[PDB]
Design a protein around this nucleic acid. Structure first.
Ligand SMILES: [Mn+2]
Ligand SMILES: [Mn+2]
Lengths: 189, 187, 185
DNA sequence: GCGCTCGCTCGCTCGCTGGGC
DNA sequence: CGCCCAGCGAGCGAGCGAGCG
Protein backbone atom coordinates (compact mmCIF):
# COMPACT_ATOMS: atom_id res chain seq x y z
CA UNK A 1 0.00 0.00 0.00
CA UNK A 2 2.23 2.88 -1.34
CA UNK A 3 1.83 6.69 -1.69
CA UNK A 4 2.70 9.40 -4.17
CA UNK A 5 3.66 12.81 -2.71
CA UNK A 6 2.61 16.13 -4.11
CA UNK A 7 3.92 19.32 -2.54
CA UNK A 8 1.69 22.37 -3.06
CA UNK A 9 2.83 25.86 -2.07
CA UNK A 10 0.34 28.40 -0.73
CA UNK A 11 0.93 32.17 -0.53
CA UNK A 12 -0.26 35.15 1.65
CA UNK A 13 -2.22 37.53 -0.81
CA UNK A 14 -4.45 35.93 -3.62
CA UNK A 15 -6.40 37.37 -6.69
CA UNK A 16 -10.88 38.88 -6.31
CA UNK A 17 -9.80 38.67 -2.62
CA UNK A 18 -9.34 41.76 -0.37
CA UNK A 19 -9.92 42.74 3.27
CA UNK A 20 -12.29 45.64 2.35
CA UNK A 21 -15.03 43.17 1.24
CA UNK A 22 -16.64 39.77 1.72
CA UNK A 23 -14.76 36.91 0.23
CA UNK A 24 -14.49 33.16 0.74
CA UNK A 25 -10.96 33.23 2.12
CA UNK A 26 -11.39 35.82 4.88
CA UNK A 27 -14.89 34.87 5.96
CA UNK A 28 -13.81 31.50 7.41
CA UNK A 29 -13.18 31.18 11.12
CA UNK A 30 -11.40 27.98 12.21
CA UNK A 31 -11.64 26.09 15.45
CA UNK A 32 -9.67 23.26 16.87
CA UNK A 33 -11.74 20.19 17.72
CA UNK A 34 -12.06 19.42 21.47
CA UNK A 35 -9.54 16.56 21.41
CA UNK A 36 -6.78 18.77 19.96
CA UNK A 37 -4.09 20.13 22.31
CA UNK A 38 -2.78 22.70 19.77
CA UNK A 39 -2.58 26.49 20.17
CA UNK A 40 -5.04 28.23 17.80
CA UNK A 41 -3.03 31.46 17.97
CA UNK A 42 -0.08 29.96 16.10
CA UNK A 43 -2.38 28.91 13.20
CA UNK A 44 -2.70 31.37 10.31
CA UNK A 45 -6.23 31.15 9.10
CA UNK A 46 -6.31 32.80 5.70
CA UNK A 47 -3.60 30.48 4.32
CA UNK A 48 -5.24 27.52 6.06
CA UNK A 49 -8.55 28.43 4.43
CA UNK A 50 -6.89 28.32 0.98
CA UNK A 51 -5.06 25.11 1.82
CA UNK A 52 -8.24 23.33 2.88
CA UNK A 53 -9.92 24.12 -0.53
CA UNK A 54 -6.81 23.03 -2.39
CA UNK A 55 -6.57 19.61 -0.66
CA UNK A 56 -10.35 19.09 -0.75
CA UNK A 57 -10.43 19.86 -4.48
CA UNK A 58 -7.28 17.84 -5.11
CA UNK A 59 -8.80 14.73 -3.55
CA UNK A 60 -12.16 15.17 -5.29
CA UNK A 61 -10.30 15.25 -8.60
CA UNK A 62 -7.97 12.47 -7.51
CA UNK A 63 -10.91 10.18 -6.85
CA UNK A 64 -12.31 10.93 -10.34
CA UNK A 65 -9.09 9.99 -12.19
CA UNK A 66 -8.09 7.05 -9.95
CA UNK A 67 -11.63 5.59 -9.82
CA UNK A 68 -10.83 4.86 -6.16
CA UNK A 69 -13.19 6.73 -3.90
CA UNK A 70 -11.99 5.84 -0.37
CA UNK A 71 -8.37 6.16 -1.51
CA UNK A 72 -6.13 6.57 1.54
CA UNK A 73 -4.56 10.02 2.10
CA UNK A 74 -2.62 12.06 4.60
CA UNK A 75 -2.31 15.83 4.09
CA UNK A 76 -0.20 18.10 6.30
CA UNK A 77 -0.07 21.89 5.96
CA UNK A 78 3.12 23.58 7.12
CA UNK A 79 4.65 27.02 7.57
CA UNK A 80 8.24 27.13 6.27
CA UNK A 81 11.04 29.36 6.34
CA UNK A 82 9.86 30.99 2.98
CA UNK A 83 6.43 29.58 2.01
CA UNK A 84 3.48 27.83 3.44
CA UNK A 85 3.28 24.32 1.87
CA UNK A 86 1.17 21.20 1.91
CA UNK A 87 2.47 17.68 1.69
CA UNK A 88 -0.23 15.59 0.00
CA UNK A 89 0.20 11.78 0.34
CA UNK A 90 -2.21 9.85 -1.80
CA UNK A 91 -2.43 6.11 -2.32
CA UNK A 92 -1.18 4.89 -5.73
CA UNK A 93 -4.26 2.71 -6.38
CA UNK A 94 -5.76 3.29 -9.82
CA UNK A 95 -2.92 5.49 -11.10
CA UNK A 96 0.08 3.84 -12.64
CA UNK A 97 3.26 5.84 -12.39
CA UNK A 98 3.46 6.18 -16.21
CA UNK A 99 0.27 8.12 -16.19
CA UNK A 100 0.50 10.27 -13.03
CA UNK A 101 1.76 13.37 -14.83
CA UNK A 102 -1.10 13.58 -17.33
CA UNK A 103 -3.55 13.28 -14.45
CA UNK A 104 -1.77 15.73 -12.10
CA UNK A 105 -1.75 18.42 -14.83
CA UNK A 106 -5.54 18.03 -15.11
CA UNK A 107 -5.78 18.45 -11.33
CA UNK A 108 -3.32 21.35 -11.39
CA UNK A 109 -5.33 23.15 -14.08
CA UNK A 110 -8.53 22.55 -12.19
CA UNK A 111 -7.05 24.06 -9.00
CA UNK A 112 -5.91 27.16 -10.90
CA UNK A 113 -9.34 27.60 -12.45
CA UNK A 114 -11.33 27.07 -9.24
CA UNK A 115 -9.13 28.47 -6.46
CA UNK A 116 -6.98 30.99 -8.43
CA UNK A 117 -9.65 32.22 -10.91
CA UNK A 118 -7.57 31.15 -13.91
CA UNK A 119 -4.40 33.05 -12.85
CA UNK A 120 -1.39 30.71 -12.33
CA UNK A 121 0.38 31.38 -9.04
CA UNK A 122 3.75 33.11 -9.27
CA UNK A 123 5.32 31.05 -6.47
CA UNK A 124 8.28 29.24 -8.13
CA UNK A 125 7.57 25.48 -8.15
CA UNK A 126 4.18 25.60 -6.53
CA UNK A 127 2.82 22.17 -7.55
CA UNK A 128 5.49 19.49 -7.55
CA UNK A 129 5.38 15.69 -7.40
CA UNK A 130 8.25 14.10 -5.50
CA UNK A 131 10.68 12.25 -7.73
CA UNK A 132 13.36 9.64 -7.03
CA UNK A 133 16.09 12.15 -7.95
CA UNK A 134 16.84 15.77 -7.25
CA UNK A 135 17.47 16.33 -10.96
CA UNK A 136 15.64 15.51 -14.17
CA UNK A 137 15.05 11.92 -15.35
CA UNK A 138 13.94 10.03 -12.23
CA UNK A 139 10.74 8.20 -11.46
CA UNK A 140 7.71 9.29 -9.50
CA UNK A 141 8.51 8.35 -5.92
CA UNK A 142 6.43 5.78 -4.05
CA UNK A 143 6.78 6.02 -0.34
CA UNK A 144 5.17 3.64 2.13
CA UNK A 145 3.19 4.55 5.20
CA UNK A 146 6.24 4.96 7.45
CA UNK A 147 6.91 8.37 5.84
CA UNK A 148 4.15 9.77 8.03
CA UNK A 149 5.74 8.89 11.42
CA UNK A 150 9.31 9.52 10.18
CA UNK A 151 8.83 12.87 8.44
CA UNK A 152 5.37 14.34 9.05
CA UNK A 153 4.27 13.50 12.56
CA UNK A 154 7.30 15.01 14.37
CA UNK A 155 6.49 18.54 13.19
CA UNK A 156 5.36 20.88 15.99
CA UNK A 157 3.97 24.41 16.12
CA UNK A 158 4.33 26.79 14.44
CA UNK A 159 5.72 24.69 11.56
CA UNK A 160 2.67 22.42 11.89
CA UNK A 161 -0.47 24.29 10.88
CA UNK A 162 -3.05 21.57 10.19
CA UNK A 163 -3.55 18.03 8.93
CA UNK A 164 -6.22 15.81 7.37
CA UNK A 165 -6.50 12.07 6.90
CA UNK A 166 -8.91 9.20 6.33
CA UNK A 167 -6.40 6.72 7.80
CA UNK A 168 -7.79 5.33 11.09
CA UNK A 169 -4.48 5.05 12.92
CA UNK A 170 -3.73 8.75 12.25
CA UNK A 171 -7.13 10.43 12.83
CA UNK A 172 -6.23 11.32 16.44
CA UNK A 173 -2.73 12.38 15.44
CA UNK A 174 -3.69 15.10 12.96
CA UNK A 175 -4.23 17.82 15.53
CA UNK A 176 -2.77 16.24 18.68
CA UNK A 177 0.88 16.83 19.61
CA UNK A 178 0.82 14.22 22.40
CA UNK A 179 -0.63 11.58 20.07
CA UNK A 180 1.97 12.56 17.42
CA UNK A 181 4.72 12.20 20.03
CA UNK A 182 3.28 8.74 20.95
CA UNK A 183 3.12 7.28 17.44
CA UNK A 184 6.63 8.60 16.69
CA UNK A 185 8.04 6.81 19.79
CA UNK A 186 5.89 3.68 19.09
CA UNK A 187 7.27 3.62 15.52
CA UNK A 188 10.88 3.34 16.92
CA UNK A 189 10.32 -0.47 17.00
CA UNK B 1 32.39 -2.72 -38.50
CA UNK B 2 32.33 -3.09 -34.61
CA UNK B 3 30.68 -5.49 -32.12
CA UNK B 4 28.95 -5.36 -28.75
CA UNK B 5 29.50 -8.30 -26.42
CA UNK B 6 26.87 -9.87 -24.25
CA UNK B 7 27.81 -12.67 -21.85
CA UNK B 8 24.96 -14.98 -20.93
CA UNK B 9 25.39 -17.59 -18.19
CA UNK B 10 23.64 -20.98 -18.50
CA UNK B 11 23.12 -23.38 -15.58
CA UNK B 12 23.61 -27.24 -15.15
CA UNK B 13 19.79 -27.76 -15.16
CA UNK B 14 12.80 -32.69 -14.98
CA UNK B 15 14.36 -36.09 -15.81
CA UNK B 16 11.16 -38.04 -14.94
CA UNK B 17 9.30 -36.67 -18.00
CA UNK B 18 9.47 -35.39 -21.56
CA UNK B 19 10.73 -31.86 -21.93
CA UNK B 20 12.31 -29.79 -24.64
CA UNK B 21 15.72 -29.64 -22.96
CA UNK B 22 16.34 -33.33 -22.43
CA UNK B 23 14.77 -34.58 -25.65
CA UNK B 24 17.41 -33.06 -27.93
CA UNK B 25 20.28 -35.27 -29.17
CA UNK B 26 23.20 -33.31 -30.70
CA UNK B 27 25.55 -34.44 -33.47
CA UNK B 28 28.65 -32.81 -34.85
CA UNK B 29 28.40 -31.97 -38.53
CA UNK B 30 30.71 -34.07 -40.79
CA UNK B 31 33.37 -31.30 -41.25
CA UNK B 32 33.90 -30.99 -37.47
CA UNK B 33 36.93 -32.61 -35.83
CA UNK B 34 35.61 -32.17 -32.26
CA UNK B 35 34.96 -34.87 -29.64
CA UNK B 36 31.21 -35.19 -28.94
CA UNK B 37 31.87 -36.75 -25.53
CA UNK B 38 33.28 -33.53 -24.11
CA UNK B 39 30.11 -31.59 -25.07
CA UNK B 40 27.39 -31.34 -22.45
CA UNK B 41 24.12 -31.50 -24.30
CA UNK B 42 21.46 -30.32 -21.83
CA UNK B 43 23.23 -26.99 -21.28
CA UNK B 44 23.98 -26.75 -24.98
CA UNK B 45 20.30 -27.30 -25.74
CA UNK B 46 19.40 -24.30 -23.55
CA UNK B 47 22.22 -22.20 -25.02
CA UNK B 48 21.05 -22.79 -28.57
CA UNK B 49 17.56 -21.46 -27.70
CA UNK B 50 18.95 -18.49 -25.90
CA UNK B 51 21.15 -17.39 -28.78
CA UNK B 52 18.50 -18.14 -31.41
CA UNK B 53 15.91 -16.08 -29.50
CA UNK B 54 18.47 -13.36 -28.74
CA UNK B 55 19.23 -12.86 -32.43
CA UNK B 56 15.63 -12.96 -33.54
CA UNK B 57 14.96 -10.14 -31.08
CA UNK B 58 18.19 -8.33 -31.92
CA UNK B 59 17.15 -8.16 -35.57
CA UNK B 60 13.76 -6.65 -34.60
CA UNK B 61 15.27 -3.82 -32.55
CA UNK B 62 18.29 -3.09 -34.76
CA UNK B 63 16.24 -3.22 -37.99
CA UNK B 64 19.24 -5.07 -39.42
CA UNK B 65 18.29 -8.56 -40.49
CA UNK B 66 21.54 -10.06 -41.82
CA UNK B 67 23.41 -8.45 -38.82
CA UNK B 68 26.78 -10.06 -38.34
CA UNK B 69 27.25 -12.24 -35.26
CA UNK B 70 29.52 -14.73 -33.62
CA UNK B 71 28.34 -16.78 -30.64
CA UNK B 72 30.53 -19.13 -28.64
CA UNK B 73 29.32 -21.32 -25.80
CA UNK B 74 31.88 -22.24 -23.13
CA UNK B 75 32.29 -24.29 -19.97
CA UNK B 76 34.02 -22.28 -17.26
CA UNK B 77 35.12 -23.58 -13.88
CA UNK B 78 31.94 -22.12 -12.26
CA UNK B 79 29.33 -21.62 -14.97
CA UNK B 80 28.61 -22.38 -18.55
CA UNK B 81 28.51 -19.08 -20.47
CA UNK B 82 27.98 -17.80 -24.01
CA UNK B 83 29.80 -14.87 -25.52
CA UNK B 84 27.41 -13.16 -27.93
CA UNK B 85 29.07 -10.80 -30.41
CA UNK B 86 26.63 -8.74 -32.39
CA UNK B 87 27.27 -5.98 -34.91
CA UNK B 88 26.50 -2.44 -33.67
CA UNK B 89 24.56 -1.44 -36.80
CA UNK B 90 21.17 0.09 -35.98
CA UNK B 91 21.79 0.38 -32.22
CA UNK B 92 23.51 3.43 -30.86
CA UNK B 93 25.31 2.89 -27.57
CA UNK B 94 22.94 5.30 -25.72
CA UNK B 95 20.09 2.97 -26.51
CA UNK B 96 21.61 -0.50 -26.12
CA UNK B 97 20.41 -0.99 -22.52
CA UNK B 98 16.74 -0.34 -23.22
CA UNK B 99 16.90 -2.80 -26.08
CA UNK B 100 18.84 -5.50 -24.21
CA UNK B 101 16.30 -5.43 -21.41
CA UNK B 102 13.56 -6.11 -23.91
CA UNK B 103 15.59 -9.05 -25.10
CA UNK B 104 16.44 -10.15 -21.55
CA UNK B 105 12.77 -10.11 -20.64
CA UNK B 106 11.78 -12.03 -23.67
CA UNK B 107 14.34 -14.73 -22.85
CA UNK B 108 13.05 -15.05 -19.28
CA UNK B 109 9.49 -15.35 -20.51
CA UNK B 110 10.21 -17.88 -23.25
CA UNK B 111 13.09 -20.00 -21.97
CA UNK B 112 12.67 -19.58 -18.17
CA UNK B 113 8.81 -19.52 -18.07
CA UNK B 114 8.77 -16.07 -16.41
CA UNK B 115 11.13 -16.99 -13.52
CA UNK B 116 14.36 -14.93 -13.52
CA UNK B 117 17.50 -17.08 -13.20
CA UNK B 118 19.27 -17.04 -9.85
CA UNK B 119 22.76 -17.14 -11.37
CA UNK B 120 24.45 -13.90 -10.14
CA UNK B 121 25.04 -11.65 -13.18
CA UNK B 122 23.59 -13.89 -15.81
CA UNK B 123 22.98 -11.39 -18.64
CA UNK B 124 25.74 -8.81 -18.84
CA UNK B 125 26.91 -6.46 -21.56
CA UNK B 126 30.66 -5.85 -21.63
CA UNK B 127 31.64 -2.37 -20.51
CA UNK B 128 34.81 -0.32 -20.84
CA UNK B 129 35.34 -0.64 -17.07
CA UNK B 130 35.07 -3.37 -14.47
CA UNK B 131 32.90 -1.11 -12.30
CA UNK B 132 29.91 1.17 -12.83
CA UNK B 133 30.02 4.30 -15.06
CA UNK B 134 31.86 3.16 -18.16
CA UNK B 135 30.60 2.88 -21.70
CA UNK B 136 29.32 -0.06 -23.68
CA UNK B 137 32.40 -1.67 -25.22
CA UNK B 138 32.80 -1.89 -28.98
CA UNK B 139 35.32 -4.52 -30.11
CA UNK B 140 36.27 -5.07 -33.71
CA UNK B 141 36.40 -8.38 -35.50
CA UNK B 142 39.89 -9.24 -34.20
CA UNK B 143 38.37 -10.18 -30.81
CA UNK B 144 37.27 -13.47 -32.41
CA UNK B 145 40.77 -14.73 -33.38
CA UNK B 146 42.46 -13.21 -30.29
CA UNK B 147 40.08 -14.38 -27.60
CA UNK B 148 37.42 -16.80 -28.95
CA UNK B 149 39.03 -19.00 -31.57
CA UNK B 150 41.92 -20.29 -29.39
CA UNK B 151 39.58 -21.99 -26.95
CA UNK B 152 39.80 -25.79 -27.08
CA UNK B 153 37.81 -28.63 -25.52
CA UNK B 154 36.37 -28.94 -22.97
CA UNK B 155 36.20 -25.14 -22.47
CA UNK B 156 34.84 -24.84 -26.05
CA UNK B 157 31.37 -26.38 -26.29
CA UNK B 158 29.88 -24.99 -29.45
CA UNK B 159 29.74 -21.96 -31.75
CA UNK B 160 27.50 -20.22 -34.32
CA UNK B 161 28.12 -17.51 -36.88
CA UNK B 162 26.83 -15.96 -40.09
CA UNK B 163 30.34 -14.55 -40.90
CA UNK B 164 31.71 -16.33 -44.04
CA UNK B 165 35.35 -16.37 -42.84
CA UNK B 166 34.40 -18.12 -39.59
CA UNK B 167 31.76 -20.65 -40.72
CA UNK B 168 34.38 -23.43 -40.95
CA UNK B 169 36.02 -22.38 -37.70
CA UNK B 170 32.98 -22.77 -35.44
CA UNK B 171 33.34 -26.52 -34.90
CA UNK B 172 36.80 -27.15 -36.34
CA UNK B 173 39.88 -27.05 -34.05
CA UNK B 174 42.33 -27.28 -37.00
CA UNK B 175 40.60 -24.39 -38.79
CA UNK B 176 40.61 -22.43 -35.50
CA UNK B 177 44.33 -23.14 -35.08
CA UNK B 178 44.86 -21.93 -38.71
CA UNK B 179 43.03 -18.59 -38.44
CA UNK B 180 44.76 -17.89 -35.10
CA UNK B 181 48.21 -18.41 -36.65
CA UNK B 182 47.15 -16.52 -39.85
CA UNK B 183 46.03 -13.60 -37.64
CA UNK B 184 49.59 -13.32 -36.10
CA UNK B 185 51.04 -13.43 -39.65
CA UNK B 186 49.12 -10.08 -40.02
CA UNK B 187 51.07 -8.52 -37.04
CA UNK C 1 32.39 33.88 -2.56
CA UNK C 2 34.91 31.58 -4.44
CA UNK C 3 36.15 31.32 -8.07
CA UNK C 4 37.01 28.63 -10.59
CA UNK C 5 39.92 29.36 -12.97
CA UNK C 6 39.94 28.47 -16.64
CA UNK C 7 43.04 29.11 -18.69
CA UNK C 8 42.44 29.57 -22.38
CA UNK C 9 45.35 29.74 -24.84
CA UNK C 10 45.17 31.98 -27.91
CA UNK C 11 47.42 31.64 -30.96
CA UNK C 12 49.87 34.21 -32.32
CA UNK C 13 49.37 33.55 -36.02
CA UNK C 14 47.42 37.81 -37.77
CA UNK C 15 48.67 35.48 -40.50
CA UNK C 16 48.76 33.43 -42.49
CA UNK C 17 46.32 31.40 -40.21
CA UNK C 18 43.69 32.70 -42.71
CA UNK C 19 41.38 34.24 -39.99
CA UNK C 20 41.68 37.79 -41.14
CA UNK C 21 39.09 39.38 -38.81
CA UNK C 22 41.60 39.57 -35.95
CA UNK C 23 43.32 42.28 -38.03
CA UNK C 24 40.13 44.33 -38.51
CA UNK C 25 39.45 45.78 -35.09
CA UNK C 26 41.32 48.87 -33.89
CA UNK C 27 41.76 49.05 -30.08
CA UNK C 28 41.96 52.20 -27.90
CA UNK C 29 42.91 52.49 -24.25
CA UNK C 30 40.21 54.25 -22.26
CA UNK C 31 41.22 57.73 -20.92
CA UNK C 32 41.89 56.55 -17.33
CA UNK C 33 44.45 53.95 -18.49
CA UNK C 34 48.18 54.66 -18.15
CA UNK C 35 49.26 51.72 -20.34
CA UNK C 36 51.37 51.82 -23.49
CA UNK C 37 49.19 50.88 -26.53
CA UNK C 38 52.31 49.87 -28.50
CA UNK C 39 53.07 46.89 -26.29
CA UNK C 40 49.55 45.52 -26.84
CA UNK C 41 49.17 43.06 -29.68
CA UNK C 42 45.79 43.74 -31.21
CA UNK C 43 45.09 40.70 -33.39
CA UNK C 44 45.46 38.29 -30.47
CA UNK C 45 43.55 40.72 -28.23
CA UNK C 46 40.78 40.83 -30.76
CA UNK C 47 40.39 37.07 -30.55
CA UNK C 48 40.73 37.06 -26.74
CA UNK C 49 37.95 39.55 -26.36
CA UNK C 50 35.49 37.36 -28.32
CA UNK C 51 36.53 34.26 -26.36
CA UNK C 52 35.94 35.77 -22.96
CA UNK C 53 32.74 37.54 -24.02
CA UNK C 54 31.36 34.27 -25.44
CA UNK C 55 32.66 32.24 -22.46
CA UNK C 56 30.76 34.42 -20.03
CA UNK C 57 27.58 34.49 -22.15
CA UNK C 58 27.63 30.67 -22.03
CA UNK C 59 28.70 30.58 -18.40
CA UNK C 60 25.64 32.61 -17.47
CA UNK C 61 23.37 30.20 -19.38
CA UNK C 62 24.61 27.10 -17.56
CA UNK C 63 25.06 28.69 -14.10
CA UNK C 64 21.71 30.49 -14.24
CA UNK C 65 23.56 33.39 -12.58
CA UNK C 66 23.54 36.45 -14.81
CA UNK C 67 25.63 39.01 -12.90
CA UNK C 68 28.10 36.30 -11.88
CA UNK C 69 31.35 37.88 -10.73
CA UNK C 70 34.37 37.55 -13.02
CA UNK C 71 37.88 38.74 -13.58
CA UNK C 72 39.62 38.00 -16.93
CA UNK C 73 43.25 38.85 -17.66
CA UNK C 74 44.92 38.35 -21.04
CA UNK C 75 48.66 37.76 -20.98
CA UNK C 76 51.61 37.23 -23.29
CA UNK C 77 53.35 34.36 -21.62
CA UNK C 78 56.77 32.82 -21.99
CA UNK C 79 55.24 30.13 -24.32
CA UNK C 80 51.72 31.23 -25.57
CA UNK C 81 49.25 34.12 -25.30
CA UNK C 82 46.73 33.04 -22.63
CA UNK C 83 43.79 34.34 -20.66
CA UNK C 84 43.14 33.58 -17.02
CA UNK C 85 39.34 33.43 -16.61
CA UNK C 86 38.11 33.69 -12.98
CA UNK C 87 34.43 33.01 -12.62
CA UNK C 88 32.32 32.78 -9.47
CA UNK C 89 31.28 29.22 -8.51
CA UNK C 90 27.60 30.14 -7.94
CA UNK C 91 25.19 27.81 -9.75
CA UNK C 92 27.83 25.24 -10.77
CA UNK C 93 28.75 22.53 -8.36
CA UNK C 94 32.29 21.18 -8.78
CA UNK C 95 30.92 17.70 -9.75
CA UNK C 96 29.31 19.18 -12.81
CA UNK C 97 31.85 21.79 -13.98
CA UNK C 98 33.45 19.51 -16.58
CA UNK C 99 30.26 18.65 -18.43
CA UNK C 100 29.45 22.36 -18.61
CA UNK C 101 32.93 23.51 -19.62
CA UNK C 102 32.89 21.10 -22.58
CA UNK C 103 29.67 22.59 -23.80
CA UNK C 104 31.31 26.00 -23.55
CA UNK C 105 34.48 24.71 -25.21
CA UNK C 106 32.51 23.31 -28.11
CA UNK C 107 30.52 26.55 -28.42
CA UNK C 108 33.76 28.57 -28.69
CA UNK C 109 35.17 26.32 -31.35
CA UNK C 110 31.94 26.54 -33.41
CA UNK C 111 31.54 30.28 -33.06
CA UNK C 112 35.18 31.74 -32.94
CA UNK C 113 37.13 28.97 -34.77
CA UNK C 114 34.46 28.02 -37.37
CA UNK C 115 34.36 24.42 -36.14
CA UNK C 116 38.14 23.78 -36.39
CA UNK C 117 39.66 22.85 -33.00
CA UNK C 118 42.81 24.76 -32.22
CA UNK C 119 46.04 22.77 -32.43
CA UNK C 120 47.60 24.50 -29.39
CA UNK C 121 48.31 21.75 -26.82
CA UNK C 122 45.91 21.99 -23.87
CA UNK C 123 44.23 25.20 -24.99
CA UNK C 124 41.21 25.15 -22.65
CA UNK C 125 42.09 23.94 -19.17
CA UNK C 126 40.49 24.28 -15.78
CA UNK C 127 42.85 24.66 -12.81
CA UNK C 128 42.98 21.64 -10.58
CA UNK C 129 44.28 21.08 -7.07
CA UNK C 130 47.12 18.93 -8.51
CA UNK C 131 49.48 19.02 -11.45
CA UNK C 132 48.60 15.44 -12.31
CA UNK C 133 45.38 13.52 -12.78
CA UNK C 134 42.91 12.84 -9.96
CA UNK C 135 42.63 16.17 -8.13
CA UNK C 136 39.65 18.43 -7.64
CA UNK C 137 38.57 21.53 -9.46
CA UNK C 138 40.34 24.38 -7.64
CA UNK C 139 38.39 27.09 -5.86
CA UNK C 140 40.37 30.25 -5.18
CA UNK C 141 39.03 33.23 -3.30
CA UNK C 142 39.26 36.83 -4.39
CA UNK C 143 42.78 37.33 -3.07
CA UNK C 144 44.15 35.45 -6.11
CA UNK C 145 43.60 38.62 -8.11
CA UNK C 146 45.93 40.89 -6.05
CA UNK C 147 48.47 38.11 -5.34
CA UNK C 148 48.86 36.67 -8.83
CA UNK C 149 47.06 38.78 -11.46
CA UNK C 150 47.39 42.43 -10.52
CA UNK C 151 51.24 42.49 -10.27
CA UNK C 152 51.69 41.65 -13.96
CA UNK C 153 53.14 44.54 -15.99
CA UNK C 154 53.68 45.17 -19.70
CA UNK C 155 54.30 43.40 -21.98
CA UNK C 156 53.16 40.30 -20.06
CA UNK C 157 49.93 42.16 -19.25
CA UNK C 158 47.90 42.76 -22.39
CA UNK C 159 44.36 43.52 -21.20
CA UNK C 160 41.78 42.77 -18.53
CA UNK C 161 38.02 42.74 -17.93
CA UNK C 162 35.89 42.61 -14.77
CA UNK C 163 32.48 43.34 -13.35
CA UNK C 164 33.93 43.56 -9.80
CA UNK C 165 33.68 47.18 -8.55
CA UNK C 166 36.94 47.24 -6.58
CA UNK C 167 38.89 46.12 -9.68
CA UNK C 168 37.26 48.18 -12.49
CA UNK C 169 39.98 50.87 -12.26
CA UNK C 170 42.75 48.30 -11.91
CA UNK C 171 42.12 46.47 -15.21
CA UNK C 172 44.03 48.90 -17.38
CA UNK C 173 45.87 50.97 -14.79
CA UNK C 174 49.38 50.04 -13.64
CA UNK C 175 49.40 52.64 -10.83
CA UNK C 176 46.05 51.40 -9.51
CA UNK C 177 47.34 47.80 -9.78
CA UNK C 178 50.47 48.78 -7.84
CA UNK C 179 48.22 50.42 -5.18
CA UNK C 180 45.86 47.45 -4.59
CA UNK C 181 48.85 45.09 -4.44
CA UNK C 182 50.55 47.18 -1.71
CA UNK C 183 47.16 47.74 0.07
CA UNK C 184 46.60 43.95 0.06
CA UNK C 185 50.04 43.09 1.58
C1' DG D 1 54.54 14.16 -5.11
C1' DC D 2 52.51 11.11 -8.90
C1' DG D 3 50.35 7.60 -11.63
C1' DC D 4 46.43 5.16 -10.93
C1' DT D 5 41.79 3.17 -8.94
C1' DC D 6 36.95 2.73 -8.70
C1' DG D 7 32.48 3.87 -6.40
C1' DC D 8 29.87 7.58 -7.33
C1' DT D 9 27.30 11.97 -9.78
C1' DC D 10 23.73 13.88 -12.46
C1' DG D 11 22.62 16.57 -16.95
C1' DC D 12 21.03 14.39 -20.66
C1' DT D 13 18.94 10.62 -24.22
C1' DC D 14 15.22 8.93 -26.69
C1' DG D 15 12.12 4.58 -27.41
C1' DC D 16 8.02 3.57 -25.06
C1' DT D 17 3.18 4.39 -22.96
C1' DG D 18 -1.50 5.32 -23.14
C1' DG D 19 -5.09 9.05 -22.13
C1' DG D 20 -7.13 12.43 -25.07
C1' DC D 21 -9.11 13.60 -29.42
C1' DC E 1 -9.39 2.78 -34.35
C1' DG E 2 -5.32 5.39 -35.24
C1' DC E 3 -2.41 9.71 -34.11
C1' DC E 4 -0.46 12.97 -31.09
C1' DC E 5 2.82 14.11 -27.83
C1' DA E 6 3.68 15.12 -22.56
C1' DG E 7 5.33 12.25 -19.51
C1' DC E 8 8.21 8.73 -18.55
C1' DG E 9 12.71 6.92 -16.27
C1' DA E 10 16.44 3.21 -16.91
C1' DG E 11 20.27 3.72 -19.03
C1' DC E 12 24.27 6.52 -20.21
C1' DG E 13 29.26 7.76 -19.43
C1' DA E 14 32.54 11.88 -19.02
C1' DG E 15 33.82 13.62 -15.23
C1' DC E 16 34.91 13.49 -10.35
C1' DG E 17 38.43 13.26 -6.48
C1' DA E 18 39.69 10.88 -1.95
C1' DG E 19 42.34 7.42 -1.42
C1' DC E 20 46.22 4.12 -2.38
C1' DG E 21 51.15 2.68 -2.71
MN1 LIG F 1 36.30 -16.16 -21.31
MN1 LIG G 1 50.45 32.96 -16.10
Amino acid sequence: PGFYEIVIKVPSDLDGISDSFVNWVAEKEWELPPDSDMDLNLIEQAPLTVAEKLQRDFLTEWRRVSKAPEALFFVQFEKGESYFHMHVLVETTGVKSMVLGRFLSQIREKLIQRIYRGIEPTLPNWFAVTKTRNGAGGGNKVVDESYIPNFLLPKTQPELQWAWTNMEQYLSACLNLTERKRLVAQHLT
